Amino acid sequence: AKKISHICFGMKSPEEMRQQAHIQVVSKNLYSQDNQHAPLLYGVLDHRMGTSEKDRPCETCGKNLADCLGHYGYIDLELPCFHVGYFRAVIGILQMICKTCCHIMLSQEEKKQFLDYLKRPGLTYLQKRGLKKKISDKCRKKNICHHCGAFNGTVKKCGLLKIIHEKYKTNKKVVRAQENLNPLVVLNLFKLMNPEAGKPSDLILTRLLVPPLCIRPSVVSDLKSGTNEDDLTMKLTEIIFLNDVMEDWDFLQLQCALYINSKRVDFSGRTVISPDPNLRIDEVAVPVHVAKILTFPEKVNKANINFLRKLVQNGPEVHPGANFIQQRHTQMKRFLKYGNREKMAQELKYGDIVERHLIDGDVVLFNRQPSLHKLSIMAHLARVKPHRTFRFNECVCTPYNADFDGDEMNLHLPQTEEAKAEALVLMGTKANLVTPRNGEPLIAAIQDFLTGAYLLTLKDTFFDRAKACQIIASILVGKDEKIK
Amino acid sequence: FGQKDSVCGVSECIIMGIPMNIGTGLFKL
Amino acid sequence: MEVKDANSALLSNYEVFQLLTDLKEQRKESGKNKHSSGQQNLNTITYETLKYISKTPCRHQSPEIVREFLTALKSHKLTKAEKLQLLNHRPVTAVEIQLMVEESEERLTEEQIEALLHTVTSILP
Amino acid sequence: MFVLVEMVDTVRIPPWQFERKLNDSIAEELNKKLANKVVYNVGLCICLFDITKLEDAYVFPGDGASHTKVHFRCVVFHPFLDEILIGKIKGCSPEGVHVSLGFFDDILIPPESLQQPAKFDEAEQVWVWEYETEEGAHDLYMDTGEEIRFRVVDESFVDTSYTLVGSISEPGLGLLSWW
Amino acid sequence: YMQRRLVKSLEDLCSQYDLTVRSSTGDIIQFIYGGDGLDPAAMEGKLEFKRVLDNIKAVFPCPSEPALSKNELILTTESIMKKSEFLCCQDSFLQEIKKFIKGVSEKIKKTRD
Amino acid sequence: TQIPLEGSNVPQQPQYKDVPITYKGATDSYIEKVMISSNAEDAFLIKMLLRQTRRPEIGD
Amino acid sequence: AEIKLCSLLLQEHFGEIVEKIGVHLIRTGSQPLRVIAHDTGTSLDQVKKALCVLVQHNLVSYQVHKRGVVEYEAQCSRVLRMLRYPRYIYTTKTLYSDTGELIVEELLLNGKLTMSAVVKKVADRLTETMEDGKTMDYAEVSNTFVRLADTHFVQRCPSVDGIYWQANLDRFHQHFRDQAIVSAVANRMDQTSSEIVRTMLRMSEITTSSSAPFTQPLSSNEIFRSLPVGYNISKQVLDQYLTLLADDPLEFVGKSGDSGGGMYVINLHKALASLATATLESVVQERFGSRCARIFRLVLQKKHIEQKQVEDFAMIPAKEAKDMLYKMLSENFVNILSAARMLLHRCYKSIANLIERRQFETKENKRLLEKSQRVEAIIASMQATGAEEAQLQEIEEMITAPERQQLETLKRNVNKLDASEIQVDETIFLLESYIECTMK
Amino acid sequence: FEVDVCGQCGLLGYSGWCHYCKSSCHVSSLRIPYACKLLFQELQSMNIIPRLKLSKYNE
Amino acid sequence: ANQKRITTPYMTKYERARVLGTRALQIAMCAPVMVELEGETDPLLIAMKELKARKIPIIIRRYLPDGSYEDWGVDELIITD
């Protein structure tokens, strides 16, 4: 129907955040401390609250480990604390609200600026606060061209401190809790203008909410030796002593700042490269012990079942075979060291899905660095020849720099047959020989083919009907050429 | 400050894992 | 998941009953093994609905009685609800409609409802 | 008369029958996931009678299944204007007495919605009809399965419990042992 | 740096069927690929007037000879040419822009002959 | 497995989650020396000469 | 909280779209119809209807901005005045008769209406209230209209059978302040003090706004010229008690003479601070206890910072003394401006909770109004014709005893929550008067 | 993974009956790598605009 | 939907290769199987069998965001050449 079409980051939806609440602060200790054991406790680091161990009742998801999407829960602490980011904002923009009046930003005006703001794209409303960056609280209260000047308040850059005196300005400063202002008046004055998205009020650092435990792994040693986790925002549970309760707000926000604010790989392989020219230009070949690398869909089809069962009976230690085959009932069964299997009811036991080895393309991809062209990874065939090199028709070493120091090379494995057919017949025969970046062939006699063929062409060389021998590696030759 | 981010092009698509939609990936029967 | 219009029908009642019988006899046709494990409870609803329908006196007869109960009531300012009730019971007797059943006497002024009473006696059990 | 409902849901046509017969297969697909208990309000294991149109039958970007949607009509049993039927007493309970009509299964009936003197005798879990007519204490002892000509008002879908309530105590007739 | 930055900055370019490029909001970048509509994929020998002469050199339809000074016969073939790609048109603007220069090229071929 | 504080009493070594030291590659080694090299603390090493005579092949 | 309270009020009084647009204009300030429809996603006709409802109820005040299309903006306090419509109309019943009650009710809900419109509407409306006839005319209504206008309560709207009128909330707040101060002097002194304070306040209404910090001195010679009819206190008694209130730590009216003839001045700011402390004491007694009120009274002449004295007033060991000081600081009960504004925030949230609770008691049982109306219609049709007791017995089996008792319980809870709303609304009026008065 | 998540009373939870919010109208089942979900989580602490919506693949 | 005039008498190679891919999935789920059902009879080469289609009775519809639905039957136009 519809997958993602327009998505951005995620946050705390407070409702679904807090129905999954189990415990905020059970006691002074956690991790089943006082039990002198560790059955499963205490109700927040366990069950779930975010599925960070082998199994427990996953909340709104299930089951372990993945597909238990991060579970939420109210772990509120209610430690007095405020907006550190808006601490800095208030310090910088110097009381942008014009506290404690919060009068209308503009007056009449000139509605030209009004309609210009209302009929322009976003990322622009900062100009209103820029206009009132300085004039805020130093102006005529209830006047034209703005409504600020109330009430003589400018903020001081005393670090994270926001000291708001009834400034002249520059003539009313004090040093030790006098001439201060509380962020609660800022909160009330909320209660650049857009509360649809830009709400500083709800970001108050008093109803702090936690990301789920899917961020944090805990390496329980099965030995009770080290269970470190990172970071995380729940750690302030140990401050229950101060949880009972202007410079005090600065101290609280300083304590907060400690722990509040600041297509890779699939189905791969890498070995060394030393090729053959016996591999027809489209074909390539891999090692043999890449067939020991598996767990392929190759979903069974009706015309295929018998040809699949032929290799299904082989198992773990035969090249043309099968292993770990995905069963009909979503419970895949192995033919590896626990195999002792392959009775294989001939139409149903894997009637959905099978998984074989590299028999014939079955395309594979080859990696290079740096990938100068898009023709440094191309589509080409298989089957299969041993001696774990990266062998391929040596006329196409140019767009790979398949350098021959013996420095290794990377192989892919694509296990999805949707655009695999599309890939194999679009960038397999037209990608190689013709580039749009230059218009010049990449495939070419790299070396001695050049001089060997040259020497053939040299007006000297006269041959024998007995030298129909060398003819016959070419046009009386390997697969797909034996006409006369 | 509640300001949006401009990482919403198409190079994000590979980290975000969605089908491409331009020229031919915008099928509307 | 999603639906748009939740009321898009005004049809013949006993016709809907026989069509539910047809739905019952058609769902059981899906007894083949390929389509057996997937969906079967439609059989269950068809059978239970047919059982409750058999409880009703609405059986043994045709949807022509529906057009009777329409043409004899909508022509005398009766609402769709009253004839709807009278269809859902399919009155066994005539005086049923008058005293054993209600809201079916005055909109015809107890004069032409007698014709529907005679029809009910003629066809309905 | 039974209400047809326009419905729009995902249709997953398997590739097994991409070229085979369509219309009846489409109907089977529609009946696939419209089951009794919980799909939507109002919907419970029901079907169609006429077509309207068949919209975009996509496959996928490149994946297996299909992306067909629904334009059809769904034969629901909406709770109508108290349509007169026969209501068999489905069960018994101290809170209320269960009834069966034909729309849903569970039909709660409060005590006073029984005959006004007839109470629930929890000493025997029987809603004995204290049929206090003709001045007589005629206790019509009828357990689960009491004959009552029910007509119901409502239907429910969301709560932890398909529960109904058919309003009884007809002023024009009374005699809830029959009506 | 510059390779990854060029790749990171220049993905949205597409080639929708109106012969015109479009952008994240479908804003026109081009209308043709330089009149020709061509791109360097099929850059055959010199495009495509000298190598193809050799291509048809190598498959010899023997029956013909110089009797009528075929230059005029070459002009008649230019006429059947003028007819045979005025049925040109499709996704177009790629043949008329060069059809007359084609004609001029065969005309100079006839003059040389 | 015994908690250093006054924790569980029973873990007086029935609680072994054995930690094997096993790994190798896709060819036979040959254990050639075994070492109990123990500094002044009994922190037993096991030094081992896992020799693998990989004579050359296409690619070396 | 504040805007949440405004939304709850607007939903209670008028409807949904009106409340939406009022909240939106409170948040965003000045905005014309088009951007309002763009941001709120509401059709233009509904936006216009809701805005004209707001203007009719004098909620949204609009000024013609520069480029000739009308913008709109709402004031949070103006919508918080939707709290006081019950209180406005009730105090109208208090000060003047039911005719003035209907005048103010129409000007606050029926909104802008002319002299002819208001006068004739209420005149034809009040005829049915009295006995059959009595031929009550428009002339007396117009006379009461003019009289109440003279008292500044209801003023003719300026122009931006006419012409429209409205109620001046400024004089309503002035009357509230006068009544509150009279009651405060009554409940902190004897009734003589409150009556004398009333004597001072009698001629200080139209020359004084709703946020003035002090009133005019009143010479005792004219107070003897204007002796109270209910208090025939002589010159000696009046002067002695006024000068005693001058040399009174209460200071509800004070000397500023020397020379005479007695410049007795009521200190509005000091009395307002005393009333704020008394309301804080009441809330402390209710939730945090009466002994916390005792420590409040103790530390009235004490800290904040530093911490080196409060244990003396604690009288109990220093551990819990320091704990009580820490909870005094944490609760932000001293920055008087910030603490008082946060207390106003507490009362905003409290009335929001009370109105939401009343919404439950009036709406969660909404599947009862139709039943009650049908039963009442049955009773009306039964009492006149067919008064048999069988129908009464059937109704009693229909109105079961649990049903009637839960109806009484929900009505009782509605009344309790309404009274709580009204008490905390008086508290919010005091707090907002402080907020508009503490501004310096 | 076609996990279920949306903006209208929905988050990273079940598909058929979301114990987070089983509104039954907000089922999405969107293909997404777990990296974006980790971004959701780690940015829950560091507040930022959480835009979430869908669109039709069809006409 | 006769807005089919602005395509060369050829489908593009990208569209053709991807329709071959989706026909691969088709003939790889159970069967839409075609002119020769399994005359080409081979083991697990899923793709390389429906490449030999040369008829392809299916429709594909190509667009532009500021344009309508330029539709095309596979039959009615020329092939990869």
Check residue G412 and report its DSSP letter: H
Q: Tell me which residue of E98, E103, E105, E102 sits closest to E35, measured CA to CA.
A: E98
The whole-angstrom separation of Cα A456 and Cα A247 is 93
Q: Across the interface, do B24 and I69 touch by the CB < 8 Å criterion?
A: no
The whole-angstrom separation of Cα E56 and Cα A81 is 86
The whole-angstrom separation of Cα I13 and Cα B24 is 12
The whole-angstrom separation of Cα A132 and Cα A199 is 19
Q: Tell me which residue of I29, I25, I30, I33 sits closest to I55, measured CA to CA.
A: I33
Residue A160, preceding bond cis, omega within 30 degrees? no
- I65 CB neighbours in chain E (<8 A) are 16, 22, 26
Nearest to H57 among D40, D55, D58 (CB): D58
Q: Extract long-range pairs of G195-202: CB within 8 Å, 24+ residues apart.
A: G195/G228, G195/G230, G195/G231, G196/G231, G196/G233, G196/G238, G196/G241, G196/G242, G196/G245, G196/G253, G197/G252, G197/G253, G197/G266, G198/G228, G199/G223, G199/G226, G199/G228, G199/G231, G200/G253, G200/G264, G200/G266, G201/G266, G202/G226
Residue G261, preceding bond cis, omega within 30 degrees? yes
Residue to test with chain B: of I6, I16, I19, I62, most B Cβ within 10 A: I62
In angstroms, the Cα distances linking D114 to A1, C88, G390, G402, G403 are: 49, 23, 18, 17, 17
Q: Tell me which residue of A133, A158, A137 sits closest to A253, measured CA to CA.
A: A158
Second CATH level (architecture) for the domain G1-81: Orthogonal Bundle (1.10)
Search chain A and give the residue with CA nearest I13.
A426
The whole-angstrom separation of Cα A58 and Cα A89 is 40
Pairing verdict, β A366-367 and D163-164: unpaired
The whole-angstrom separation of Cα C66 and Cα C89 is 12
Q: Extract long-range pairs of A370-378: CB within 8 Å, 24+ residues apart.
A: A370/E3, A372/A399, A372/A401, A373/A399, A373/A435, A373/A437, A373/A442, A374/A427, A374/A431, A375/A399, A375/A431, A375/A432, A375/A435, A375/A442, A376/A400, A377/A412, A378/A427, A378/A428, A378/A431, A378/A432
The whole-angstrom separation of Cα G268 and Cα G209 is 12
- A439 CB neighbours in chain E (<8 A) are 40, 43
Report residue B1 as tokens.
Answer: 């400050």
Q: Residues G266, G269, G270, G272: what is their CA dihedral angle, to the nearest 10 degrees? A: 100
Search chain D and give the residue with CA nearest I19.
D62
Q: How many CB atoms lie within 10 A of CB A349?
A: 17
* H3 and H12 Cβ atoms separated by less than 8 Å: yes
- What contacts D175, CB < 8 A, 6 or more positions away? D133
Tell me the residues of C at the H interface, defined by beta carbons under 8 Å apart. Answer: 1-2
In angstroms, how far is CA E92 from the centroid of its own chain?
A: 11
In angstroms, the Cα distances linking I13 to A430, E33, I10, I76 are: 10, 19, 9, 16
Q: Across the interface, do H59 and D40 touch by the CB < 8 Å criterion?
A: no
Residue with tokens 């080196």: G308
Residue G380 C-alpha, separation from nearest chain D C-alpha, in angstroms: 18
Q: Across the interface, do I29 and D59 touch by the CB < 8 Å criterion?
A: no
- Stretch (H or E) spanning G122: helix G115-126
Search chain H and give the residue with CA nearest D57.
H58
Residue A194 C-alpha, separation from nearest chain B C-alpha, in angstroms: 10
Q: Across the interface, do B29 and D61 touch by the CB < 8 Å criterion?
A: no
* A107 and A143 Cβ atoms separated by less than 8 Å: yes
Cβ contact B–F (≥3 pairs, < 8 Å) = no
Greatest C-alpha distance within chain F: 62
- Which phi and psi (to 5°) does residue G223 adopt? -65, -35
Nearest to A13 among H2, H11, H43 (CB): H11
Residue A49, preceding bond cis, omega within 30 degrees? yes
Let me know if A104 is exposed, middle or buried by CB neighbors in 10 A (0-12, 13-18, 19+): middle
Let me know if G281 is exposed, middle or buried by CB neighbors in 10 A (0-12, 13-18, 19+): middle
Q: Please indicate if any CB of chain A lies within 8 Å of the CB of D59.
A: no
Give the resolution in Å. Answer: 4.0
Q: Across the interface, do A422 and I13 touch by the CB < 8 Å criterion?
A: no
Q: Residues I46, I52, I54, I58: what is their CA dihedral angle, to the nearest 10 degrees? A: -10
- What contacts E17, CB < 8 A, 6 or more positions away? B23, E91, I6, I7, I62, I63, I64, I67, I70
Dihedral class, residue G316 (left if φ above 0, else alpha if ψ from -120 to 50, else beta): beta
The whole-angstrom separation of Cα G195 and Cα A462 is 140
* D112 and D97 Cβ atoms separated by less than 8 Å: no
- DSSP helix/strand/coil, I10: strand
Check residue A473 and report its DSSP letter: G
* A147 and A99 Cβ atoms separated by less than 8 Å: no
The whole-angstrom separation of Cα G17 and Cα G36 is 12
- CA pseudo-torsion sign G113, G115, G117, G123: positive
Q: Extract long-range pairs of A23-29: CB within 8 Å, 24+ residues apart.
A: A23/A75, A24/A74, A24/A75, A24/A76, A24/A77, A24/A237, A25/A77, A25/A237, A25/A240, A25/A243, A28/A238, A28/A240
What's the angle, vertex CA A140, arms to CA A138 and CA A141, rounded to 5? 100
The whole-angstrom separation of Cα D58 and Cα D68 is 6
Q: Across the interface, do D62 and A1 touch by the CB < 8 Å criterion?
A: no
- Stretch (H or E) spanning A154: strand A153-155
Residue to test with chain H: of B6, B7, B13, B15, most H Cβ within 10 A: B15
The whole-angstrom separation of Cα G198 and Cα G184 is 11
Which chains lie within 8 Å of chain G at 3 or more CB pairs, if any? A, D
- CA pseudo-torsion sign A288, A290, A295, A299: negative
Residue H30 C-alpha, separation from nearest chain D C-alpha, in angstroms: 14
Report residue G75 as tokens.
Answer: 């004031």
Beta-strand runs (E) in A346-412:
366-367, 409-411
Beta-strand runs (E) in H1-59:
2-3, 30-31, 52-53
Ligand-binding annotation for H21, yes or no, is: yes
Q: What is the CA radius of gyration of chain C?
A: 18
* G23 and G62 Cβ atoms separated by less than 8 Å: no
Pairing verdict, β D72-76 and D3-8: antiparallel
The whole-angstrom separation of Cα E29 and Cα E7 is 18
* D127 and D121 Cβ atoms separated by less than 8 Å: yes
- Helix ranges restricted to H, chain D: 23-32
Q: How many CB atoms lie within 10 A of CB A38?
A: 16
Search chain D and give the residue with CA nearest C96.
D173
Nearest to D1 among C13, C44, C52 (CB): C13
- What contacts C79, CB < 8 A, 6 or more positions away? none
Which chains lie within 8 Å of chain A at 3 or more CB pairs, if any? B, D, E, F, G, H, I
- What contacts G388, CB < 8 A, 6 or more positions away? G382
Residue F8 C-alpha, separation from nearest chain A C-alpha, in angstroms: 5
Instruction: Count the residues in chain E.
Output: 113
Residue G357 C-alpha, separation from nearest chain D C-alpha, in angstroms: 24
- Stretch (H or E) spanning D100: strand D99-100
- I38 CB neighbours in chain A (<8 A) are 303
Q: Please indicate if any CB of chain E lies within 8 Å of the CB of B10.
A: yes
Residue with tokens 């049709």: G381
Q: Please indicate if any CB of chain E lies within 8 Å of the CB of A436.
A: yes
Which residues of A define the annotated binding site? 58, 61, 68, 71, 98, 101, 133, 145, 148, 156, 264, 270, 368, 403, 405, 407
How many alpha carbons lie under 13 Å from residue C48 in its C-beta half-sphere? 15
Report residue G304 as tokens.
Answer: 């904040």
Residue to test with chain D: of A418, A420, A426, most D Cβ within 10 A: A418
Nearest to I22 among D14, D16, D59 (CB): D59
- DSSP helix/strand/coil, G145: helix
Q: Tell me which residue of D163, D100, D34 sits closest to C41, measured CA to CA.
A: D34
The whole-angstrom separation of Cα H17 and Cα H5 is 12
Q: Across the interface, do E11 and B10 touch by the CB < 8 Å criterion?
A: yes
- Stretch (H or E) spanning G350: helix G336-359
Beta-strand runs (E) in G30-146:
31-32, 71-72
Pairing verdict, β D106-107 and D163-164: parallel
* D23 and D68 Cβ atoms separated by less than 8 Å: no
- G338 CB neighbours in chain A (<8 A) are 181-182, 184-185
Which residues of A define the annotated binding site for RNA? 368, 407
Report residue G354 as tokens.
Answer: 């009370």
Cβ contact G–C (≥3 pairs, < 8 Å) = no
Residue-wise DSSP of G375-396: HHHHHHHHHHS---HHHHHHHH
Q: How many CB atoms lie within 10 A of CB C122?
A: 10
Q: Tell me which residue of H37, H8, H53, H45 sits closest to A12, measured CA to CA.
A: H45
* Cβ burial C3-28 (10 Å sphere, 16+ → b, else e): beebeebeebbbbbbbbbbebbeebe
